[model samples]
Target: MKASRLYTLVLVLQPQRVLLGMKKRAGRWNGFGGKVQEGETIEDGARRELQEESGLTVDALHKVGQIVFEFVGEPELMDVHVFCTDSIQGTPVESDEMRPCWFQLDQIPFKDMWPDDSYWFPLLLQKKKFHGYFKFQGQDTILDYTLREVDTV
Candidate 1:
């Protein structure tokens, strides 16, 4: 198999709310991110994607977790580096790719997100580092998975 494609997902946060975007193509609520470009560090890619999709820039980003996604019948895996940051630098405006919005921590729309999010999102909110693997049967069904908090990610 070839090396997994690198992706970066950034979660912008406030004291009680988290920022999310309604993806233009997928129409699902998710963090701002996309594939890491050639020679770009994961964190740099995260910053770039966040700005491209939400018109926001971060001051400091914390690496909260990492996950590997395996879709059945697909040879390439997705290696996603997850980040969370409360220090932001600009207003969140809608882009051609996303419509930005904020949600209360307790009111996250898990039903509208990828199935694996419910498994690991809690750890992120708890301020814990984590690592996980999810095997998907299809676009919406996770056939198997593993998730755990870690000292470092």
Candidate 2:
């Protein structure tokens, strides 16, 4: 089966808040991103998602991490590319797919986010880059996973 293409844009605001896109389905806060359309590079897809979901233009970005995983009893694999940018040029506004908002580092509501986020978010906030994979049976059940810090490429 073909992989499910995805990309994420993590916008870090100065003095400490992280911009998040509130997903309609989950009604929870998450990153700015979505499924990649055909013929778009991951970076392009990321930027597109950032604009569509958050209504903010990215000034700069850097690769952070990637996660490949399969859902339980599913035949497809998901390739998720993650990126981060501390510098941004405009204010974030809510969109159809997402409601843009910011949260302080210590005030992040982890309970409402994907379970896997707690594992790698700290490193990303520290300006470290990572690449990894996570396998899950369902939303809350992680079957397997691995993460490693890497130099920015």
Q: State, as a TM-score between 0 and 1, how close model 1 is to the true structure.
A: 0.95
Q: Which lDDT value does model 1 have at 7? A: 95
Task: Give the alpha carbon lDDT tens digit for every residue of 1-153 in model 1.
Answer: 546989999999788999999978677899989999998888999999888888898866789999999999989999999999998898999867688999998899999888899999988988899999999998798888999999989
Alpha-carbon RMSD to native, per candidate: 1.2, 2.1
TM-score of each predicted structure versus truth: 0.95, 0.87
lDDT of 2 by residue, 4-106 (tens): 6565555554567887877865677788777888898788888888877777777556788887767878877777888887788788886566777788878
Where does candidate 2 stray beyond 4 Å?
1-6
Clashes of 1: 0
What's each prediction's clash count?
0, 0
Runs off by more than 4 Å, candidate 1: none
